[PDB]
Design a binder for this molecule. Structure first.
Ligand code: 7TY
Ligand code: B7G
Ligand code: B7G
Length: 263
């Protein structure tokens, strides 16, 4: 059907399902309590409202692990949102449920690291629904291997933010990431490949209207999708190293299901 109406339905599903949009994020980043060390982190854990109460975080262990647990909490919450967003797409919900799980399994991290740029600048990122701002420099200061899993996302993010997508672009781009026919173990590859093609056509149609003067932005974005696959590969490898060497660190079982059969 019409790609304009298609794009608009995806945009609405996005606004309906993501509490933090790039619009809101940039309105904040241009105030949040700044977290740049242990003291301000401690002040934040007492004065800021977090979706997940510390309380129920895995019992405390140390500062680098505590930050990791907050990262893991926000990841799982974003997987939740991405799942409802995908289900809010009729062609996704028409797939058999096992293919829906396959697509989410192998796509959510690519999508999540794409959306992360919306809440990032070169100096840190928003946390706790925009009420906090954690400094990139602080996160660099965590002990390995926790610092190493973080900085690569910043690098991708700052480059990705140079393309100046808005939320209406992102909605289509994230949909293209999820509805990807290359994922291992997909049952109905032709059906998923055909949905992906419609989304990609819609995306190019959208960028022509929304970004009339930006040449090469569509192929640029196709390359970011390739880049995101490599970012997630390396991320999954780092998470396997943490599972092996940080045996006291608690790993959410949903995320371990995601990494189970990755290499
Ligand atoms: O994938 C897993 O197994 C979970 C393991 C991810 C570990 C690496 O997480 C990050 C790496 C780079 C940038 C951002 C994140 C995490 N992150 C965050 O939103 C985030 C970052 C920091 C804090 C925080 C609070 C107090 O002090 C620090 C809270 C939340 C987003 C990445 C995408 C989905 C959420
Ligand atoms: C409408 C759903 C009806 C039941 C579908 C049964 C699906 O089987 C399982 O799907 C999973 C992917 O999600 C794979 O990980 C498993 O290897 C596979 O055995
Ligand atoms: C919540 C949406 C995202 C969920 C991603 C988690 C995927 O885990 C997979 O669930 C399948 C069905 O149980 C199993 O067959 C696989 O072994 C397991 O790898």
């Amino acid at each position: 059907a019409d790609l304009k109406a298609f794009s608009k339905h995806i945009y609405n599903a996005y606004l309906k399902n993501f509490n933090m949009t790039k619009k809101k994020a940039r309105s904040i980043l241009t105030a949040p309590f700044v977290i740049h060390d242990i003291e301000t982190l401690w002040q934040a854990e007492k004065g800021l409202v977090w979706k997940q109460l510390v309380n129920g975080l895995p019992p405390y262990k140390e500062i680098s692990v505590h930050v990791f647990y907050r990262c893991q909490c926000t990841t799982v919450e974003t997987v939740r949102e991405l799942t409802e967003f995908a289900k809010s797409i009729p062609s996704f919900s028409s797939l058999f449920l096992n293919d829906q799980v396959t697509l989410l399994k192998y796509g959510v991290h690519e999508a999540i690291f794409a959306m992360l740029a919306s809440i990032v600048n070169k100096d840190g990122l928003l946390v706790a629904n925009g009420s906090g701002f954690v400094t990139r420099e602080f996160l660099r200061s965590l002990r390995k291997p926790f610092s190493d899993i973080i900085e690569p996302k910043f690098e991708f993010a700052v480059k990705f933010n140079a393309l100046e997508l808005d939320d209406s672009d992102l909605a289509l781009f994230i949909a293209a990431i999820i509805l990807c026919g290359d994922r291992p173990g997909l049952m109905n590859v032709p059906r998923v490949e055909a949905i992906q093609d419609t989304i990609l056509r819609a995306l190019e149609f959208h960028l022509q209207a929304n970004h009339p003067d930006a040449q090469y932005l569509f192929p640029k974005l196709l390359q970011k999708m390739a880049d995101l696959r490599q970012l997630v590969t390396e991320h999954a490898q780092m998470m396997q190293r943490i599972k092996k060497t940080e045996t006291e660190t608690s790993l959410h079982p949903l995320l371990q299901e995601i990494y189970k059969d990755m290499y």
